[PDB]
Amino acid sequence: VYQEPTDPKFPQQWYLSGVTQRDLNVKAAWAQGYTGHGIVVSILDDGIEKNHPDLAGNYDPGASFDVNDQDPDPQPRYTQMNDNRHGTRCAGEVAAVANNGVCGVGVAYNARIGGVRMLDGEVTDAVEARSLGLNPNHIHIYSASWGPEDDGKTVDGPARLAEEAFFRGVSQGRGGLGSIFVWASGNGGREHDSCNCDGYTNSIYTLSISSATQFGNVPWYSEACSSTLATTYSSGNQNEKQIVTTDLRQKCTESHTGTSASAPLAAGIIALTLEANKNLTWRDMQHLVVQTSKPAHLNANDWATNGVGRKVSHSYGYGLLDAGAMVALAQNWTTVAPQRKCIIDILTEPKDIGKRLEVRKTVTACLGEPNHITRLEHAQARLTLSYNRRGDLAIHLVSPMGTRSTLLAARPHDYSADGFNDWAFMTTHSWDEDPSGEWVLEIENTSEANNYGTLTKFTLVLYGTASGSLVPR
């Protein structure tokens, strides 16, 4: 009979378990025997308090480095403002020690936990790459609660070294099974930011995780976009509870908040899942998340049923992670087929955008070729366009099965005249659909202004396989 943790703050970790069902169903995974033993998670952040009384027992120097000062020790830099507390808070969510009379517990409270000190300084492309590519045959899961500015006017993503680190990680990392990169989808809700304008969350190589409040609502800071894959609980209003974790200076906090708290909880659940089947590939893990995540009682006005019967929202992806379902489904999972990539150049000539532009194209998805895809994973619309005020644009993509993905919603603060330069807008919402057939791209001016521009390139990039489908939900 499984005995739940006795830690003093465990009863306040409402998101881990409860009679109420507003939780991540983590105790169910613990009771199946999965607590994270043998899995290694690294927090890419501003450092980790490696001697914290609730982290020391799980701390792994092999999962750690200090990229900012070029040494092995990721200890945070202590200041009066406690600026560098952020990574320690994230680490305790994953792997705070259980049953030791201190604070609460991590989701994967027997996993090994490290940190890369890389945010406390100028975060260059090289800094990111050295962090994302740290010890990739030892670290299984990387958690990143950071990214480009959430001002609602930035379009930015990994530069060359960081993108090379992503491809090296998913291709050769973890013994060729692929590093697992977990990303917080963003805090730009108040600025009406879109997480598709963030190349880290928008990457197919990251599991981008959004947030829900305790009462099941879209938090004020949440960013909506089609690249988000799933959701974990985090903070909301001041009547809703927050996240309990390890704090700087060997303290315990019950007020960890924002998108920053959601990615580590997902990383911990993924750690439990990897313990249940260490042979899972980076793509396997995304399939598991898609199949097991739960929309129920998450409130959003944009819930839609996709072509294979799954509910999907731009605020939540496929819904809340469900640790018990993840670990159960993982145990007998059959490895997915190798990933195929079908490139379809859509345009035969540039197209003036004007007030509204619709581009329709019927595709065969590489029929007859070795990269034929009948079972979609990620899809990208790689767009090159000029426009006089970028944030007035709304962009939608409709799949042959009728699933309408918002690639870009209006961003009131984005005044840029720089347009999009082969920007790979990504959607998860057509996962497992057959991509053969008519795709529709819609670009529209959401303002009354007389805006102007031209779409010069639209590449539809399909990823997926040609085997192994489930009967639709």
């Binding site: 952040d45 501003d46 952020h86 945010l119 100028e122 975060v123 260059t124 990111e128 609660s145 950071w146 990214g147 480009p148 500015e149 959430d150 930015d156 920053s260």
Partner: peptide
């Protein structure tokens, strides 16, 4: 360039 990058933010917590």
């Amino acid at each position: 360039r990058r933010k917590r």
